[PDB]
Amino acid sequence: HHHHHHSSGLVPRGSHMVIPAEANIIVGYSHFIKTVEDLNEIIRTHVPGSKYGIGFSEASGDRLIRYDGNDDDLVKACIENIRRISAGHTFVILIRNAYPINILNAVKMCQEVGSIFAATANPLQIIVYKGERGNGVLGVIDGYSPVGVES
Ligand code: NA
Secondary structure (H helix, E strand, C coil): CHHHHCCCCCHHHHHEECCCCCCCEEEECCCCCCCCHHHHHHHHHHHHEEEEEEEECCCCCCCCCCEEECCHHCCCCCHHHHHHHHHCCCCEEEEEECCHHHHHHHHHHHHCCCEEEECCCCCCEEEECCCCCCEEEEEEECCCCCCCCCC
């Protein structure tokens, strides 16, 4: 027996992500991860020298938004983004002052323990579906639609 509420379904206005100036964001789905420390560690060697924040949506147990980082503004943005999405096992990473290869490697490392929804510096909107127990991430709007074809 399952419970249905008419309030469930695609959330009309996608959730806009808070991306502080010059920050790069990574939004993904964790695989069998129970703590944000796993993410904090797997990307630790790639974020040295840079400022970063990590947010993780614990999907059971305490069901708390978990976080780590070395920059208050980035950490707060990650927490807010996780709150807006409100979907179990979602993780959000924000990195600033990092070279291109470090950002790319951070993403590759996340792919070892999860799936990627977004990885960009562009304005970003997360399309979410509101279900019974919580939400689910259906996709993202990364930047804009094309305006033409290159010559
Ligand atoms: Na999808």
